[PDB]
Design a protein around this ligand. Structure first.
Ligand SMILES: CCC[C@@H](C(=O)Nc1cnccc1C)c1cccc(Cl)c1
Ligand SMILES: CCC[C@@H](C(=O)Nc1cnccc1C)c1cccc(Cl)c1
Lengths: 304, 304
């Protein structure tokens, strides 16, 4: 029993972190096989970041300009190339600690763990969600660029995020490992609007099931609703509309607790319309949306 | 910017996790040098747990009865001994992945990361606090016994906790790595009262400073208070009394933000007396006490 914002064990990712330096800028790199991946803005100076011409900046660079250091050893760079917003530095040595891995592009509302790094050294690990507007609410300081987000299934690390920047609003933006930004963001020091965010409804419902499993049941009521009625409330409170696909993914949690998905929607509707009345659910005084149905089943069963 | 419930990178601890089996029971072990540490209740059967005579149960056991498996390799047990509530199984092979380490006994109100494990395999990592009543509010299922709590300074892992049990209330109890329980708990399947818990005042103040650093400032007010006046409010709301030692540890955060500790106490007093009025602080709708002043400075500066 108990329910925590649990991150994946970061060990397999810690063994991939390196430091990349180009000129005066130092950030983090991900060493997988004989390739080091990092944000392409490692080639920029302060003056460049306002409106960088990355193709032109990279032309002034050579393999010997990218200094890559894994712990205390120096990697020999034999090639460099830009793919979207990431740089791929081919090195002469495959990382011996390379775990089984995949590069995935997650969907908004999905979760992942972030291993925050500075100077190629891991500082901490936390779990978070890719917001519906493609931003993440992380904890990153200058030099955290290149830190990555990932999920782990058995022995396979699926890398899904690489940190690139902090928006003037204090929220974070980044790319998939092919260097494609999530959302409309560009790697430029310019004001950039993030979309209107919404609360991930399927995740709040999953967390409500996790609460029932762990004993917090005060929010259960004598009511039910329909997808259409629930969605009218979801609209009013800027929640994502619930679809049959979301209902389907909640199937196992509904089966385990015997609480029909639409009956749980009616508890959520009442919580949206009345608030929590000074009470808590799983130690939170608000509706939590950073746990997917998969996360809840994993944590509630003991998946290693 | 941003503020997260960050756990230490778990890599150094993952390389120490093993599975220990004795008879029908399987739990987690911590392999450091040539010793494997685990909860002594690994020797118990279901009938034993109600009132176990551990000295007598261990006498029926031999080195060959403790099966210790690190991943897929089998460790040869050359000695066994009970120290308080832990068993120390001497093995013929030192763990090659043994990091620099210490065994520490943390104080109530201090924080640490937990690497939840099952069958010797890591499942997740989360940060938590040792409650003032010596319980922890973790996330543990059957088989998580033997999982450990730790802190990391540079390259040194200080192990501070080993999980032993879940109280009927759903809260967790465990020992230091010398097998001494935190609190009055005994490793028996019996109803056990945990003390009246209190909120860790120094930690809430530290988190209020973290909020100001990251932009959440709505709670700052035109007031101040004294240690005596603040403690009268702390008493009413079951908060730990604030001492000059707590004020002293908040010194750096007070210096960084220029907000005197007693002025921050007056914001906390107003929040205790008025609630949050439907607002949030660092994404929380309640007063967070699982971040120490050290944690806040570490996260806010970038300590790796
Ligand atoms: C002058 C470089 C700043 C860097 C940047 O946001 N880093 C950063 C990241 N996370 C937290 C804090 C910080 C300061 C950046 C700005 C604009 C666009 C891009 Cl691609 C990068
Ligand atoms: C019948 C063994 C149960 C075990 C126990 O609480 N495990 C456990 C731990 N964390 C979460 C869930 C669980 C089921 C235990 C009970 C009483 C005392 C002791 Cl020392 C151990």
């Amino acid at each position: 029993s108990g329910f925590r914002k649990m991150a994946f064990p970061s060990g397999k990712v810690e063994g991939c972190m390196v430091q990349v330096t180009c000129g005066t800028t130092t950030l983090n790199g991900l060493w997988l096989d004989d390739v080091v991946y990092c944000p392409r803005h490692v080639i920029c100076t302060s003056e460049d970041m306002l409106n960088p011409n990355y193709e032109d900046l990279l032309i002034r660079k050579s393999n010997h300009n990218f200094l890559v250091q894994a712990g205390n050893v120096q990697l020999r760079v034999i090639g460099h190339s830009m793919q979207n917003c990431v740089l791929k530095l081919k090195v002469d040595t495959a990382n011996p600690k390379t775990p089984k891995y995949k590069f995935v592009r997650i969907q908004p509302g999905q979760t992942f763990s972030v291993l925050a790094c500075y100077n190629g050294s891991p500082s901490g690990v936390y779990q978070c969600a890719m917001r519906p507007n493609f931003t993440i609410k992380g904890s990153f300081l200058n030099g955290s660029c290149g830190s990555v987000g990932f999920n782990i299934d058995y022995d396979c690390v699926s890398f899904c995020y690489m940190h690139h920047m902090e928006l003037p609003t204090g929220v974070h933006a980044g790319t998939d490992l092919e260097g494609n930004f999530y959302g409309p963001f560009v790697d430029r020091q310019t004001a950039q609007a993030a979309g209107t965010d919404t609360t991930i409804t399927v995740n709040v419902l999953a967390w409500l099931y996790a609460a029932v499993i762990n004993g917090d049941r005060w929010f259960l009521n004598r009511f039910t609703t329909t997808l259409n009625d629930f969605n009218l409330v979801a609209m009013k409170y800027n929640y994502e509309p619930l679809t049959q696909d979301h209902v389907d993914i909640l199937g196992p949690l509904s089966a385990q607790t015997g609480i029909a998905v639409l009956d749980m929607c009616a508890s959520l509707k009442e919580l949206l319309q009345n608030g929590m009345n000074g009470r808590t659910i799983l130690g939170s005084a608000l509706l939590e949306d950073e746990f997917t149905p998969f996360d809840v089943v994993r944590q509630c069963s003991g998946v290693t």
